[PDB]
């Protein structure tokens, strides 16, 4: 999920994309 | 340059930067 | 609790301490 | 809606909660 | 839903939302 | 203190407002 | 040191960084 | 008071300082 | 990636998120 | 510069990059 | 009173307290 | 650097006056 992805993990601006509306 | 960690309040306030207006979906449990 | 006059970032803020863990849907105007 | 009531008025956090998952 | 870690400057955000105008004290030695 | 009852183990925001004024 | 124009959230933080650890009073008016 | 201060007008960190415990 | 209106210490943590790590530069008119 | 085009106007996260290392 | 810790976002929000106007650069790679 | 003085260690706000402009 997203905390995987961006927090465990790391992730970048556009990733962070995914999770617009 | 990597890319950095993102948790918690600071993950949520970096959503709120990319998304703005269209909104967004902070879902942990997923 | 006490009322809240939250605008921008505050607000996300504000929805990631009452909601936690749960999560929460950003939703703003268009 | 909640975003532009918390800004431009004031709101509770029992109406934030409405908002969660 | 269980409750959240909140430290440092996020734990003193959150005593600032929950308490507002009332005004709060931040004691960590305490 | 705060820091034990928020920092080191969980707290919820009703015992938060144990620190009100 | 500079001056600070501060509001809201962003007061706490100050007294936060300001004081750390030997905590502070949020004392507003009412 | 000081929260007002900060505020409405500007203040010193060396005025915030007075509110440490 | 939406546009921004950003004041005081909402700047700068949007450089911070823009930039890591790379490190960047806060310069305001004086 | 920056600073007062984000508060005063709006600017990019591509506008922001410029400031990077 | 000792220090305290200060880390990515929380670090550059204090950089911006205390140099305000003046500007600051944060350069981890430093 | 910074991160070293003020993250891994601990640093005093007048040591973060070093990195003002
Ligand atoms: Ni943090
Ligand atoms: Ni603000």
Same mark, same amino acid.
């Given at each position: 999920? =997203?905390?995987? /992805?961006?927090?465990? +993990? =790391?992730? +970048?601006?556009? /990733?962070?994309?995914?999770?617009?509306? | $340059?990597?890319?950095? &960690?993102? *948790?918690?309040? &600071?993950?949520?306030?970096?959503?709120?930067?990319? *998304?703005?207006?269209?909104? $967004? $979906?902070? !879902?942990?449990? !997923?």
């Amino acid at each position: 999920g =997203i905390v995987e /992805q961006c927090c465990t +993990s =790391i992730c +970048s601006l556009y /990733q962070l994309e995914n999770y617009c509306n | $340059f990597v890319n950095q &960690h993102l *948790c918690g309040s &600071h993950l949520v306030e970096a959503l709120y930067l990319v *998304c703005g207006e269209r909104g $967004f $979906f902070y !879902t942990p449990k !997923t």
